[PDB]
Structure formats: C-alpha cells, structure tokens
From Swiss-Prot, chain A:
One of its GO terms (cellular component) is extracellular exosome. GO terms for molecular function: calcium channel inhibitor activity; enzyme binding; fatty acid binding; glutathione binding; glutathione peroxidase activity; glutathione transferase activity; protein homodimerization activity; transmembrane transporter binding. Residues 89-207 form the GST C-terminal domain. Residues 1-87 form the GST N-terminal domain. Muscle. Belongs to the GST superfamily. Mu family. It catalyses: RX + glutathione = an S-substituted glutathione + a halide anion + H(+); 11(S)-hydroxy-14(S),15(S)-epoxy-(5Z,8Z,12E)-eicosatrienoate + glutathione = (11S,15S)-dihydroxy-14(R)-S-glutathionyl-(5Z,8Z,12E)-eicosatrienoate. The record marks 209 as: Important for substrate specificity. This is Glutathione S-transferase Mu 2.
Swiss-Prot record, chain B:
This is Glutathione S-transferase Mu 3. PROSITE patterns: GST_CTER (PS50405), GST_NTER (PS50404). Residues 4-91 form the GST N-terminal domain. Belongs to the GST superfamily. Mu family. Testis and brain. One of its GO terms (molecular function) is enzyme binding. It comes from the Eukaryota. The gene is GSTM3. Pfam families: GST_C (PF00043), GST_N (PF02798).
Amino acid sequence: PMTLGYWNIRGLAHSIRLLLEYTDSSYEEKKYTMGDAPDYDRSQWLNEKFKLGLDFPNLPYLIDGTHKITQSNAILRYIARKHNLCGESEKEQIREDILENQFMDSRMQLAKLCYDPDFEKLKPEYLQALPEMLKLYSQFLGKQPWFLGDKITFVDFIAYDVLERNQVFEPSCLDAFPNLKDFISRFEGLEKISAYMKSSRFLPRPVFTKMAVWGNK
Amino acid sequence: SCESSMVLGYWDIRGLAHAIRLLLEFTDTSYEEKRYTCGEAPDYDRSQWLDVKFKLDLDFPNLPYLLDGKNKITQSNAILRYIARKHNMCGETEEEKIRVDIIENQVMDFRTQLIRLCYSSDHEKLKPQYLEELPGQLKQFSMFLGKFSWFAGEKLTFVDFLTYDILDQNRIFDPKCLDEFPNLKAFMCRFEALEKIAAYLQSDQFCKMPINNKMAQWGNKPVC
C-alpha cells in the first residue's frame, strides 16, 4: 500500500498519520532512526535518501503508486483531495489557505524555540506571547465544531497537532480558551482517532529530533 | 470594467509582495496598493503599520494583506492562491495540483534560507555556505522542470510567479548561478516576455523598490 517515510518522531508526520487513520487508508511506515552520540548519525536516511526517486528528497515523503510527494502540506492536501476532506466554496478555501499557512507559522515558532540553545531565557518570551496567538485561533473558530464549519477538513489535523503540542508544552495555555480545549477533546473523540490512539502505532512523543533542546529524544 | 480596486497592503519593499504584484498585473486585476514605510535609523520605526494594524478587520493582522470587498486575506500563499483561483491559474489535473502544492512549499523552504542569510548580521560569513549549497537546490529545480514550459507542466499557474521571484533574487545575488542550467534560463526569459510582466519590469516604481526591507543586510537598497 502507501508508504510514509519519516523519523521515528512525532514532528511533521503527526498530522499525516492521523489523517491516514481517519480515512482508513492502507499504509506502511518507514521510520528512520537518528544517532544519539555527538554525531547525530543520520546515515539511515542519507544512504537511502537519493535512491527513492523523489524530485525533492526530504522527510516526510509519501509514495502512492506512481505518485511520490514530499512536503507536509502537499502530502496532506493530496490525501485530503483523495478523500474529499477539503474546502469547496471560495470562503472555505480562503479559510483553508490562511489557516494552513498561519498554523505552519505557529509550528515553526515553537520549533525554532525548542531547538535554540538559549531555550531557558527564550521560553518566557514565548510563553507571554502565546495567549494572543491562541486568542486569534479561538476567535476564528468561534462556536463552530470545526475550523472550516460543520465539516472536518485536513486543516483540523494541522490545528490539533499545533494546539495539542502547545498544551503539552504548557498545560494551562488552553484553559483560558475553553473553545480550543473542547476542540482537542472532540477531535480525540472521533472513533478512528481514539482507536488509533489506543494502538501501538500512535507515537505521540518525542516531539522533536534528538538534537532539540526541548522535547528531544 | 472589473473596477475591483482591491487594496494590496505591504511595505514599500519588493519582498513577499513581488509575486502578488506580478500576478495582479498579469491577470489584469484592478487593484490599489498601500505601501508602508519603515524607519531607517537604528530604531526601525514601523509604527506606520502598527497604527492601522488592528483597524483593518483582519482575522490575523499581518503583511501583506489583500482587501477585496468582503474578502480580507492575509498570508502570501493564501493571497496568491485566491487571485489565481479566480483566474483558474491553479493545476487542473491531479498531477498538476500535486506539482503546484510541492512547488509552493518548496519555494518557501528556499526563500526562508535566503531571507535568513540576507537579514542575519552574520550575512558575510554565512554567504559562502549559502553559495556552496546553492547549485544543488537550483539543480533540483531544473531536474523537476525538465522539458515543460512551466513548473506545473504545460499550464501557467501561481507557482511560476513564486519560482520566478526566488530564482530572480538568487540571480541577483549571483548572476552566474543559472548558467549551468539553460533550462531555468529559458524559463526566466519566457516569463519576463509575457506582455504584462515585461511592461511592469520596465516600470519606474519597480526600479525604485528595494529587494529587502531597510534592516536587511542585503538588498535593502533599490537596484537595477
């Protein structure tokens, strides 16, 4: 079936795995292990990196028959279209586009922080700024069940990943925003998601690669 | 006429809005532009933006932004996709769509490295590293393009505007970079040859726009 290749980490593969499960897509995973020693040995990937025939060799990648796609957002949009989990009307599409980018923004914001050596002093800087970020997402969500309205689209899988990840970084962050806290619950409450979360194939952590200051391993 | 006069707001810089301005021009989209100035002194005073920032009714206040009547968009790729969608300049077939989605995110990865290199204070010491790694990235773009007219295959889409912008900036940084890639060079000419693009590229205001904002360690001044 389909093959998903990425590090044995949550990272950028989280949203993809979730989407795959939700859609009951038959797939296999090719997990790559990274070195722990000073030399974070990535040979396991590198030795295979150029032998896969991808146009732009990178992790994660999805191989579906003759299709070999890379880039998280491209993989999600592919599976989404394949299962009709995308916005239809121009309005939904606008929300979908702004959110996709906006959520990548937040992801990179946390990522850089967690990999930056000055994590200790930078953490506070991040924490105090966090609320205004969540405020915008809460307001945008409003009283809707899902970000694109009543229908759950691929954008929600990006949302869950970044929001839930921030919550593990700081449990109380979503308290002041019950709106967003209920989202996570509702999402994890989906039959296929809950089932997958009971499965050994879950892998919720580590968050980042072994060379991150926070959430490594 | 269309007379939409949708307002495009961004700094008085080429930067991210370059691909958007080009797309608007190409598709004959009637628009009005709002340029924000920055401080040149050590205190890069960006209050000009900050004053109106929370008064534009944007769900996520940011730059650039596009106000098309009841539709207010932010995030570059969302703006490009929006305008392009209205003119069917996105992939029509599953194969074209895949290419578009890969390119869009790929040029993002590429551009980020450049921005980082150009804005960083260590711009000089980092400069060589970027260059020694540059041909590899350009290589992949040539390999991906192949014998197609456009990156989406045989159809002009928004991703061509994005690819052009980043290849142009790199071309400016190192004119010789595209030489070993006659594939890319043909793309650049073919793109700049489009009536609307050619006219705009010769335009006065275009020539007076800096590549990057004043605080950038490169391209912060107008070039030709």
